[PDB]
Amino acid sequence: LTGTGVLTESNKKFLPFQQFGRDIADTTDAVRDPQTLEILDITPCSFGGV
Amino acid sequence: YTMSLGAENSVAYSNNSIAIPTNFTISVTTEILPVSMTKTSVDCTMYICGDSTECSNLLLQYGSFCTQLNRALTGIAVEQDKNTQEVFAQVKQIYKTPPIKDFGGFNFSQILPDPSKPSKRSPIEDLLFNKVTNGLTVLPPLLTDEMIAQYTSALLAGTITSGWTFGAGPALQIPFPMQMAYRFNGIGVTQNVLYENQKLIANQFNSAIGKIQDSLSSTPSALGKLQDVVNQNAQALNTLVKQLSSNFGAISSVLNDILSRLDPPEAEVQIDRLITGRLQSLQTYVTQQLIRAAEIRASANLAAIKMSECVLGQSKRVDFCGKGYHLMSFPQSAPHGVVFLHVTYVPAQEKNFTTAPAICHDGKAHFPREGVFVSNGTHWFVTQRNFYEPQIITTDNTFVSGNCDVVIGIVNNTVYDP
Amino acid sequence: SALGKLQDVVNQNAQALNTLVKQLSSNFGAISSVLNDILSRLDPPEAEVQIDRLITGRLQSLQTYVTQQLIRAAEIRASANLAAIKMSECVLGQSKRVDFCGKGYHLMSFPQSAPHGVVFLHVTYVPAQEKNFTTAPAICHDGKAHFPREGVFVSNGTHWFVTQRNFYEPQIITTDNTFVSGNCDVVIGIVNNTVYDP
Amino acid sequence: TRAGCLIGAEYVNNSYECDIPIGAGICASYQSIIAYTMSLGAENSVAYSNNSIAIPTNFTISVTTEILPVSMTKTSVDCTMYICG
Numbered sequence A: 001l002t003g004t005g006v007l008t009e010s011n012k013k014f015l016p017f018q019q020f021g022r023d024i025a026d027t028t029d030a031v032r033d034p035q036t037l038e039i040l041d042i043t044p045c046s047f048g049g050v
Numbered sequence B: 001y002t003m004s005l006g007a008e009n010s011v012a013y014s015n016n017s018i019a020i021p022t023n024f025t026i027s028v029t030t031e032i033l034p035v036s037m038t039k040t041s042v043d044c045t046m047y048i049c050g051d052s053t054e055c056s057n058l059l060l061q062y063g064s065f066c067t068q069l070n071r072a073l074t075g076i077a078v079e080q081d082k083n084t085q086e087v088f089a090q091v092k093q094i095y096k097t098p099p100i101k102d103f104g105g106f107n108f109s110q111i112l113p114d115p116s117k118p119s120k121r122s123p124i125e126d127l128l129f130n131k132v133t134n135g136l137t138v139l140p141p142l143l144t145d146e147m148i149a150q151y152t153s154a155l156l157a158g159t160i161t162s163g164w165t166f167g168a169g170p171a172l173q174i175p176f177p178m179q180m181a182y183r184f185n186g187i188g189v190t191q192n193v194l195y196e197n198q199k200l201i202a203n204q205f206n207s208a209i210g211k212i213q214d215s216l217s218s219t220p221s222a223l224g225k226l227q228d229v230v231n232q233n234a235q236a237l238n239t240l241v242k243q244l245s246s247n248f249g250a251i252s253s254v255l256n257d258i259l260s261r262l263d264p265p266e267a268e269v270q271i272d273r274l275i276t277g278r279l280q281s282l283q284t285y286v287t288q289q290l291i292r293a294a295e296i297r298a299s300a301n302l303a304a305i306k307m308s309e310c311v312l313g314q315s316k317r318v319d320f321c322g323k324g325y326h327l328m329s330f331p332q333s334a335p336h337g338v339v340f341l342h343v344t345y346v347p348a349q350e351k352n353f354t355t356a357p358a359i360c361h362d363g364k365a366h367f368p369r370e371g372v373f374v375s376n377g378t379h380w381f382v383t384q385r386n387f388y389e390p391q392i393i394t395t396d397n398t399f400v401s402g403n404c405d406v407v408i409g410i411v412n413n414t415v416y417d418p
Numbered sequence C: 001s002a003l004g005k006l007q008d009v010v011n012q013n014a015q016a017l018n019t020l021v022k023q024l025s026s027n028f029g030a031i032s033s034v035l036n037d038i039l040s041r042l043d044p045p046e047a048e049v050q051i052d053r054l055i056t057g058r059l060q061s062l063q064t065y066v067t068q069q070l071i072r073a074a075e076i077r078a079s080a081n082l083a084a085i086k087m088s089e090c091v092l093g094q095s096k097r098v099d100f101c102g103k104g105y106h107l108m109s110f111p112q113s114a115p116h117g118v119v120f121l122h123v124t125y126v127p128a129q130e131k132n133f134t135t136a137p138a139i140c141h142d143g144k145a146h147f148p149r150e151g152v153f154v155s156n157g158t159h160w161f162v163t164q165r166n167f168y169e170p171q172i173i174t175t176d177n178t179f180v181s182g183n184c185d186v187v188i189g190i191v192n193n194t195v196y197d198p
Numbered sequence D: 001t002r003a004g005c006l007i008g009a010e011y012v013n014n015s016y017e018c019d020i021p022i023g024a025g026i027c028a029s030y031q032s033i034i035a036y037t038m039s040l041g042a043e044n045s046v047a048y049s050n051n052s053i054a055i056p057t058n059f060t061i062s063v064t065t066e067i068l069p070v071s072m073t074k075t076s077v078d079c080t081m082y083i084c085g
Ligand SMILES: *[C@@H]1O[C@H](CO)[C@@H](O[C@@H]2O[C@H](CO)[C@@H](O)[C@H](O)[C@H]2NC(C)=O)[C@H](O)[C@H]1NC(C)=O
Pocket: B010, B011, B012, B019, B350, B351, B352
């Protein structure tokens, strides 16, 4: 699951088989870290018009 | 079932019978008009390609599609603020109601701002705001909700304290019972009818405003227009985001997978397939937004015209500012829209009378100066047309024209010379 | 920048035409954006592919231009319908609609032609130099409630007059500019003054 | 600003008419470039009372302009010549 984003500590309670988390619009917004099982929220990098 | 078009009503027409109302009802009705959309902007290159650079190099071959899409979206975004400005910024002075709310018994507490609330919204406005709930950015509107409410409060204060004078020049103060007496004169009802019934009219108006608040609170489908606008915008944005999950005939919908699985020869054509699919989706979204923005601009122009002709003055246009004879209107700010409270005069408790076109007296034909001749069964009176106020037929409320030989249906009576 | 509304239409149309013309210089994935080069360089089987890419791109550009032109023409048609209604109701007559023919009480309007548009000169009556007065809903005289026929009761401090509502012209309260309705016991705020009988 | 980060404009505490709109009530103007919350208009408090009326003693005849677009330039882009020459 390649991409660019900001990873933070997440309080989301993933089920013991879920590796990814998607929102309403089917964009990945949380991933379970494989090496150590921790949930990392994906926040899009700070884009915007100038 | 075959639908019913309404209740049958055979009006008791005859060639000498008239129905004159003996009472009236002060009714308040709500009109909801959307004013603005959600101002969205799209980073077209980011939407099509994300972070990959050779996808943007391929997208460069299409010229200025992204620039034109951004220009259209920017035009829509500026148009939304323009719509809000034309609807609400209809006065250059922020009027304030006096600290003492002595308006001859009329009570505007449900539409005047509530100082207790931090948002400075009226109870009706607070209820209205409570009911309505990948390179894409949402721009905030130029006018905040607090400033729109400040415009609304200024308009309310202007119409309460000055009537229609503040929309045509300097605000000229007038007591509110006399203002509503002017508005009664504007619909063909004499002002003594209002002065002699001031408490009843004030109670009817207060009850109607309270019923408006209760009706808005208890009906979840009353604000369906604004909710439809919000849902349409949200659904269009959701569709645009979900279009990125389509492969459009390519091996995958992810550019990274295509890049890491194929060499540039066939990766170029697969990425081109994705580019044309996503660009078509974006163009479809922008065209839909342009059509929707045209509809919202029509609604906003209508709302601005409603503001000018119903809030800043009394309108003679039938059914434009509510059902019935329009007295005055009050604006209320709503999310992405405006709510008008239309106060109208609805005649009630009509009574049958025998009428004549003219009265023959001393070989002369008398016609009412401003009223209508009615007979209660034995005696003939002249009354104003919208309210039963029988008066003795005299030479001051009638005028003479010719003799009695021409008018069809002229009846004999005595015209008293004062 | 007074005439910015017509200039915006002119600039939008010119910019759309310029974008349409500049789209001819995009190759849309073909080897060249010039058709003559493709025709002079390749055999028909591959020239067909290149020309098909160019046709797809240019047809898409033309369809986009026509769609924006249709939407813009709908906006201009709405504006022209509004201008026709303004002509009829402001120039061919005096309108009572508030703020439809200027700011103030509309007297008349004058049209002036402009490039791709119309300019209305809205003559309005703006009240000025207002003065405070004490006022009463009615005048009680001989146990009768008198109400103004056309104006309003005003007091200059010691005497009561009746004046037309939009311009101060104080006149002696008489039975000709007032009408009688009922007693003095009903009207809230009725004041005592004499009503002159001529 | 709620519309985003603003660089190069000094946020004054005064309130003026909107010159260059930024968003969320903040506008920009050149006095140096300043940023400010837009002023909705001069504050006015009408002297309302239950027996006072303001009657104009004079009038001003004012003429204001309304500019309305009527027509666009009539173009007819030949599809075949555009696409194919
Ligand atoms: C005026 O009189 C007419 C007839 O005298 C009334 O019309 C009648 O209304 C009743 C009740 O709906 C019907 O059953 C009759 O068929 C009607 N008669 C006719 C001839 O139409 C009318 O209601 C009266 N209006 C008022 C205000 O009293």
